[PDB]
Amino acid sequence: LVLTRKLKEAIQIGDDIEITVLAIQGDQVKLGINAPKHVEIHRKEIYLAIQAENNAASHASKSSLKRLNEQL
Amino acid sequence: IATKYHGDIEIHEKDIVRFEQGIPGFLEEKQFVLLQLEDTPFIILQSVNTPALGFVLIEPFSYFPTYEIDLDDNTLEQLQITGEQDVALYVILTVADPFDDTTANLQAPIVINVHKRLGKQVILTNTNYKTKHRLFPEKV
C-alpha cells in the first residue's frame, strides 16, 4: 500500500500502530511511530544486518568449535 | 529431541526458554534450550523444534571485559524482569574461516531470565557496538 501524507498527517496500522509524519526536512522525513511495546521498531538497515549475522552464525561445524576452543 | 552437537537428548519443559519473537532471521523458532559444549566456554542455544539449528554463545564478559549494556524498559518487560537476580546475558559467535576471524555480535546480545524461562535477542539501540567484534587481534 502506497499513501501520501502531508505534514502532520498520520497513518493507522492495526489496533494500533500509528505513523505520524512529524517533519519534512527535505532530503529526509522525521517520522514518529507509536506502537505498544510488545512490538519493536527499527531502522530497516539495522534490522537486516542483524538478520544477516544471525544467519551467518548458524553454520558452525562441530570440528570448527573444537579447533576454536583449542586456540582459545 | 535430536540436537546439533549433543546427539539425542531429552529435556524437561522447565529447561525450555521461550523466544516469543524468535530471533531475526528465524522468527518461528520460539523454543530453545541452552547446552554447554564440554570442555569449552561455548553455550549452544539449541532449537527444541529444529535439531539442525544451534547457535554458539559465549558470555561476553570473558572476552570483552568492558562490555556493558543498558536494557531499554521495553526489553525490561517483554522479558518481564523484576531486577538483576534474573538475568543471563550472552553473545552470538560467528565462527569464521579461518578461526581467528571469529566475531561476536555485541550489538545484539541474547538476553534470558533464568527463572521465568523467557528469551530475547536485544538489539542495542543508541550504542557504538558492532555486529562483528573480533575475538582475536588480527596478526599481520
Closest residue by Cα to residue B116 from B88, B74, B75: B88
N- to C-terminal Cα separation, chain A: 51
Helices and strands, counts by H and E, chain A: 2, 3
CA pair distance A19, A9, nearest whole angstrom: 9
CATH code: domain of residue B3: 2.30.290.10
Technique behind the model: X-ray
The DSSP bridge pattern shows strands B88-94 and B133-134 to be unpaired
Closest residue by Cα to residue B120 from B23, B48, B33: B23
A49 interaction partners in chain B (CB closer than 8 Å): 131
A69 interaction partners in chain B (CB closer than 8 Å): 37, 39-42
Evaluate the omega torsion of the peptide bond into residue B97 and state whether it is cis, within 30 degrees of 0: no
Give chain B's domain count: 1
In angstroms, this model's resolution equals: 2.3
Contact B56, A53 (CB under 8 A): no
β partners of residue A24: A29
Show the cell assigned to B134.
573480533
A72 interaction partners in chain B (CB closer than 8 Å): 40-41, 135
Domain range for residue B121? 1-140
Q: Which of B5, B25, B37 sits opposite A54 (nearest CB)?
A: B25
Q: What separation in angstroms does the CA of A47 have from each of A17, A41, B110, B123? A: 18, 9, 15, 8
Q: Where are the alpha helices (DSSP H) in chain B?
A: 60-63, 75-78
